Design an enzyme around this catalytic site. Structure first.
Site, PDB file in Angstrom:
ATOM      1  N   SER A 151       0.868  -1.170   0.000  1.00 50.91           N
ATOM      2  CA  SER A 151       0.000   0.000   0.000  1.00 50.91           C
ATOM      3  C   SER A 151       0.904   1.217   0.000  1.00 50.91           C
ATOM      4  O   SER A 151       1.507   1.542   1.025  1.00 50.91           O
ATOM      5  CB  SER A 151      -0.925   0.016   1.205  1.00 50.91           C
ATOM      6  N   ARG A 152       0.998   1.889  -1.142  1.00 51.76           N
ATOM      7  CA  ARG A 152       1.990   2.937  -1.311  1.00 51.76           C
ATOM      8  C   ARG A 152       1.591   4.229  -0.620  1.00 51.76           C
ATOM      9  O   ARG A 152       2.436   5.116  -0.463  1.00 51.76           O
ATOM     10  CB  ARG A 152       2.234   3.174  -2.799  1.00 51.76           C
TER      11      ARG A 152
END
Lengths: 116, 72, 284, 128, 71, 116, 72, 71
Positions: free
Chosen positions: G5-6
C-alpha cells in the site's frame, strides 16, 4: 458453511486435511517404509485409508457388471459417516468393507459378513 | 508411462490382458522407484527387488529392427 | 525456447535451493552442538593425559605391553566415517587414505584388520572384500561415551589378546569449518606419549602394574572417543559446507535460467505480436 | 580441597568439601586435605564427600582417582550426582533405550530431508 | 448494505459495449456524491473482463491491435 | 549392423548409452557435485569424460590454427579405441590427455608426455 | 509480502500505526522460515520463537466471511 | 590522430535513414583510398544501432518482420 451448513463444512475440511496429510506422506511410506513413521502419523494414514475407500460407492449402473444393486446416499448420512470415521469409531474394522458401500451401516453389515 | 491408449483393454486378447495388467503395474512401480536411486541412500531390499524386476521389464520390452513377434 | 519449461525449471531449482539451505541451517546447529560436546570432553582429557604422563613416564614402568612396541605380526585399522551421506569429501578422503595405506604396506588379506565406524566405511570395505571385523554403525548425531564404550572396550581387548599388535585411527580433524584435514593417529603402542609441564611423582596405592592395566585401556578409550567427537564435528561441518555449495550452485543456476527466461519471454511476446499484426494485415 | 567428579561426557559435581573418602580396588581409603599425591582405581561403588553433615553420595562406575592436595579429580566413565549404587544400572538402561531412540530419530530425520531433496531434483531433471 | 450501496451489472450475456461502459457508469454515479461532499467507494469486479470487451469492440471496428490484441 | 558391422554397431550404441547417462547426470553434477553418485554413475562420468574428449580430433585444416599437424583415423582403429576406452583399459590416464588426438596410441604418448 | 500500500502508514489510524510496524517484521520473518520448518530443531529460542509467533500471527489474521471486525 | 582519420557521424537524434547509411558512407569514403593502393581502417561503432534503425526503416515501410522483428 453458509451454504452447505456448519457440520458438513467441518467434516469436509477435516477429511481434506487428513487426505492432504496422507498425500504428503506418499514418498515416505513408499520409500522409507511403513514401520518407521511415528504414532500420530500412522494414525493419520490409518484413518486416511478408511476415508479414501469410503468415498467410493456401488453405482446403480454397475449392477449389470458386479451384481450389487447400488445405492443413493443422502448428504446428511455421508456427513454422519465421515464424521464417525474421523472420530475413530471405525478404526477396528479392516481397510476393506469401506470399499464400495453406500451408507455407514453397510460398512459394519459387510465387515460382519467378512470377519469380526 | 506417458503413452496412452484410449481403447486399451478392449483391443487386447484375453491372454495379453491377464499379464499386461501386472506388467503395467510393476513397470509403473519401477518408474516411480527409479526416481530415488540416482544418488544418495542406496535403498533397502524390499524395493530393490522391485527395481530389479523393473529393469527386467525394460529389458524384455526391447526389440530389434523389423522383427515382429506373434501374440503367443 | 519453451517458456513454460524454463519457468518450471526455475521453480524446481528454487525448491532444491530451499531444501539445501534448510539442510545447511540444520547442519550449522548440529555443528554447534558437536563443538559443545567436543569442548565438554576436554577437562576429562587433560587430566587423563596428565595422569598417564606422570605415571608411565615416572621411573620407567614399561611392564604393560601397551607402552612397548612388540614385533608386528598384524595391524588393526580404526576408521571413523559418517553414517549418513550428503557430505562431499568427508568419507571419500578417509576411505581412500585407508585403502591406499593398506594397499601400500600390507598386500596380504589376513595381515591387517579393519574396524569401521559408520555404514559408509562398512559398505566400502564390503564392496572391496576386506575384513571389517567390528561394525558399530547407526550412531547418533551427538554421541555420548556410552555407545562408543562397547566397541572401544572390544578394540582394546583385541589388542590385549595379542591379535592386532598395533592399530591406527583414521578420521577427519575438524580444523576450521572449511578444510577438515584427514589425519592418521596411532593407538596402542603408547611410545609417543608426551610429558606435561610439571612432572609430579605419584604414590601408587595397589602397585604400578595394576594402575597401568586399569588405566591404559581407559586412556585408549578416551583417545578413541576424542577422535570420534572430532570426526563428528568435521562431519557436520563438511555437510554444512556441502549444502552451502549446493545452495550457491543452485542460485547461480537460477540466475542463468532467469536470463534464459527473459530472452524467451521477449521472443514469445514479439512472436505473438507479429502474428496478430500479420493476421490483421491479411484482411486490409 | 576441591573435589571434582569428572565424566568423559562432562563435569558432575566440582565443588569443595571437608573430607572425601571412597573405596578403591585394593580397599577402603580416606582423603584428608593435604594428602600425598596418590593414585588408585575405584570399584563400582559410591563416593561419599561429607559436606559437614550432608555426606552427598556420588556413585562412580568404571572410575579412577587421582588426589593432589588441592585437586581431587575423580575420573569416572559413568557418574550420577545424587545417587545410591543401584541407580546407575537403571539409569544406564534408561539412557541406552533413549539413545537408541535418538539414533533412530535423527537417522529418520536425515532420510526425510534427503527424500525431499531427491524428489525436488527428480523434478528438476524431468523439467529438462 | 442496500441502504447505501448501488449495484451496477454488466453480466456476460450482455454485449461488449455494456461491459465496456459499466465502470464509467460507476464513476459517473460516484462523482455526483463526491462533488456534493460525500465519500464514495466504487468496486470494479474484474476489470480484465472490461479490458477484454474493449478489445472485442476495437477489433470488430477494425482498429489496429497492440499487444495481446489489446488496442 | 548389416551395413556397418556388429562390433562397430554395438560399440557405437554403448558410447551413446554412456554419453546419454552422463547427460542425465548433468544436473546432479551441477548442483550437488560428483560426490553423491553411487559408484557406477561415478564410473559412467569417469568414462564419458574420456569419450567426449576422445571424439575430438586434430585436423589437417586446423594446423594453421594451433600448429598441431593433424590426423587421419581409419574406422576399425577408432572402433578399437572406443572399445578399449569402454573396457576400462585407459582409466588411469588423465582426462586432458585425450583431447585433440588421432588414435589411442597417441593418447598413451600424450599422457606419457604429460607425466603420468 | 507481495501486497503493498503505497499510501499506507499514513492511511492508518494512530492506534494501528503503532502496532502494525511490529506485525510486518514478524510475518516477514516467519514467511522466510516457513519452508525451513518441516524439518529441523535448529535453534532453541532464536528462530523457533520466530516460527511460533509467526504461526500465531498467521492464525490471528484469518477470518470468516460476512463478519467485519471494527478497528478497535 | 586527425591527420589521417575521418569521422562520419550519425547521431542518436538523427532519423533512421541517416543511421542506415552511415556505414555505407564510411565504406564509400574508404574505397577511394583502397582502390588507389592506400590501406584503410574503418571502425563501425555499434552496428546494432544500424540494425535497429533498419528495423525501424523497414517496419515503417510495412515489410513483414522475422526473428526478433528484424526484416
Amino acid at each position: 458453511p453458509e451454504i452447505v451448513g456448519e457440520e458438513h463444512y467441518q467434516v469436509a475440511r477435516k477429511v481434506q486435511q487428513t487426505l492432504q496429510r496422507y498425500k504428503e506422506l506418499q514418498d515416505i511410506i513408499a520409500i522409507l517404509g511403513m514401520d518407521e513413521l511415528s504414532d500420530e502419523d500412522k494414525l493419520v494414514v490409518h484413518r486416511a485409508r478408511r476415508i479414501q475407500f469410503f468415498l467410493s460407492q456401488n453405482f446403480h449402473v454397475a449392477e449389470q457388471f458386479t451384481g450389487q444393486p447400488g445405492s443413493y446416499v443422502p448428504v446428511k448420512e455421508t456427513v454422519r459417516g465421515f464424521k464417525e470415521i474421523l472420530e475413530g469409531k471405525y478404526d477396528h474394522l479392516p481397510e476393506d468393507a469401506f470399499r464400495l458401500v453406500g451408507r455407514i451401516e453397510e460398512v459394519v453389515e459387510k465387515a460382519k459378513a467378512m470377519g469380526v | 508411462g506417458l503413452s496412452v491408449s484410449r481403447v486399451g483393454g478392449a483391443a487386447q486378447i484375453k491372454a495379453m490382458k491377464k499379464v499386461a495388467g501386472t506388467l503395467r503395474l510393476d513397470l509403473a512401480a519401477y518408474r516411480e522407484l527409479e526416481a530415488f536411486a540416482q544418488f544418495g541412500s542406496d535403498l533397502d531390499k524390499a524395493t530393490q527387488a522391485k527395481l530389479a524386476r523393473g529393469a527386467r521389464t525394460v529389458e524384455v520390452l526391447k526389440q530389434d529392427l523389423h522383427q515382429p513377434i506373434p501374440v503367443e | 525456447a519453451s517458456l513454460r519449461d524454463i519457468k518450471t525449471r526455475i521453480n524446481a531449482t528454487k525448491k532444491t535451493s530451499q531444501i539445501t539451505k534448510a539442510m545447511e541451517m540444520v547442519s550449522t546447529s548440529k555443528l554447534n552442538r558437536a563443538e559443545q560436546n567436543a569442548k565438554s570432553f576436554v577437562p576429562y582429557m587433560e587430566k587423563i593425559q596428565e595422569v598417564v604422563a606422570n605415571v608411565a613416564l615416572g621411573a620407567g614402568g614399561a611392564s604393560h605391553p601397551m607402552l612397548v612396541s612388540r614385533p608386528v605380526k598384524k595391524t588393526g585399522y580404526l576408521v571413523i566415517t559418517s553414517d549418513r551421506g550428503l557430505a562431499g569429501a568427508y568419507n571419500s578422503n578417509v576411505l581412500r587414505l585407508v585403502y591406499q595405506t593398506i594397499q601400500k604396506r600390507h598386500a596380504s588379506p589376513d595381515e591387517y584388520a579393519i574396524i569401521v565406524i559408520g555404514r559408509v566405511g562398512l559398505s566400502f570395505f564390503r564392496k572391496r572384500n576386506m575384513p571389517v571385523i567390528l561394525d558399530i554403525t547407526r550412531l547418533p548425531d551427538q554421541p555420548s561415551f556410552a555407545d562408543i564404550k562397547e566397541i572401544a572396550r572390544k578394540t582394546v581387548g583385541l589388542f590385549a589378546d595379542g591379535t592386532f599388535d598395533e592399530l591406527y585411527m583414521y578420521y577427519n580433524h575438524y580444523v576450521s569449518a572449511i578444510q577438515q584435514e584427514v589425519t592418521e593417529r596411532k593407538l596402542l603402542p603408547l611410545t609417543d606419549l608426551a610429558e606435561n609441564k610439571q612432572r609430579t611423582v605419584y604414590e601408587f596405592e595397589p602397585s604400578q602394574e595394576e594402575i597401568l592395566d586399569v588405566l591404559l585401556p581407559q586412556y585408549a578409550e578416551s583417545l578413541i572417543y576424542g577422535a570420534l567427537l572430532d570426526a563428528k564435528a568435521s562431519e557436520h561441518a563438511a555437510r554444512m559446507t556441502a549444502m552451502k555449495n549446493a545452495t550457491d550452485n543452485a542460485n547461480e543456476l537460477i540466475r542463468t535460467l532467469t536470463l534464459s527466461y527473459n530472452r524467451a519471454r521477449q521472443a514469445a511476446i514479439t512472436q505473438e505480436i507479429t502474428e496478430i499484426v500479420a493476421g490483421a494485415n491479411a484482411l486490409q | 580441597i576441591h573435589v571434582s567428579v569428572v565424566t568423559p561426557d562432562g563435569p558432575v559435581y566440582e565443588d569443595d568439601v571437608e573430607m572425601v573418602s571412597v573405596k578403591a580396588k585394593s580397599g577402603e581409603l580416606g582423603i584428608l586435605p593435604g594428602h600425598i599425591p596418590l593414585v588408585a582405581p575405584l570399584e563400582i561403588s559410591a563416593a561419599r564427600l561429607k559436606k559437614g553433615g550432608k555426606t552427598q553420595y556420588i556413585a562412580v562406575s568404571g572410575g579412577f582417582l587421582e588426589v593432589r592436595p588441592d585437586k581431587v579429580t575423580i575420573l569416572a566413565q559413568a557418574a550420577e550426582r545424587a545417587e545410591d549404587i543401584d541407580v546407575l544400572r537403571a539409569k544406564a538402561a534408561k539412557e541406552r533405550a533413549e539413545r537408541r531412540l535418538q539414533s533412530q530419530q535423527d537417522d529418520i530425520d536425515f532420510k526425510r530431508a534427503e527424500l525431499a531433496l531427491k524428489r525436488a531434483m527428480n523434478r528438476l531433471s524431468v523439467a529438462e | 448494505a442496500l441502504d447505501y450501496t448501488i449495484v451496477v451489472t454488466a453480466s456476460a450475456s450482455q454485449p461488449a459495449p455494456l461491459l465496456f461502459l459499466a465502470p464509467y457508469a460507476g464513476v459517473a454515479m460516484g462523482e455526483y456524491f463526491m462533488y456534493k461532499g460525500k465519500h464514495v467507494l466504487v468496486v470494479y469486479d474484474d476489470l480484465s473482463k472490461q479490458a477484454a470487451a474493449y478489445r472485442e469492440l476495437s477489433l470488430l471496428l477494425r482498429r489496429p491491435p497492440g499487444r495481446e490484441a489489446y488496442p
